[PDB]
């Protein structure tokens, strides 16, 4: 007992979506949309702190699970009208996901307790820079 160790609970990253939608309501929607569309995953995308980059009109995406991170990357780039030479990086829990992974795998490994996957985007490869 002298060495009892804390469990470090992971809350994920800060999102406006999480501040504006009560957790219990988020979890209800995440569970239900996964039953409605078992081959898709619900995703929240928001601009990271200090990013200097175009705004993203819509934060909520219902994504076929077999689409890759790289495909979703080009989708988001197009929605913010980024030029090809401009950078865009995604972060899930402060880590850049590999482009070859499926969105389904990223969701399975990293969805939060509300059954959403949370992605932040930035112009920089360091979250918050």
Numbering used by the authors: -11 to 117
Provide the authors' original text about this structure.
The nonstructural small (NSs) protein is the primary virulence factor of RVFV that suppresses the host’s antiviral innate immune response. Interestingly, these searches identified four putative LIR motifs that are located between residues 4–7 (4FPVI7), 59–62 (59FYNV62), 238–241 (238WIPV241) and 261–264 (261FVEV264) in the NSs sequence. In humans, the six LC3-family proteins (LC3A, LC3B, LC3C, GABARAP, GABARAPL1 and GABARAPL2) are key autophagy factors that function by regulating growth of autophagic membranes, recognition of autophagic cargoes, and fusion of autophagic membranes with lysosomes. LC3 proteins carry out their various functions during autophagy in part due to their ability to interact with other autophagy factors that contain LIR motifs.
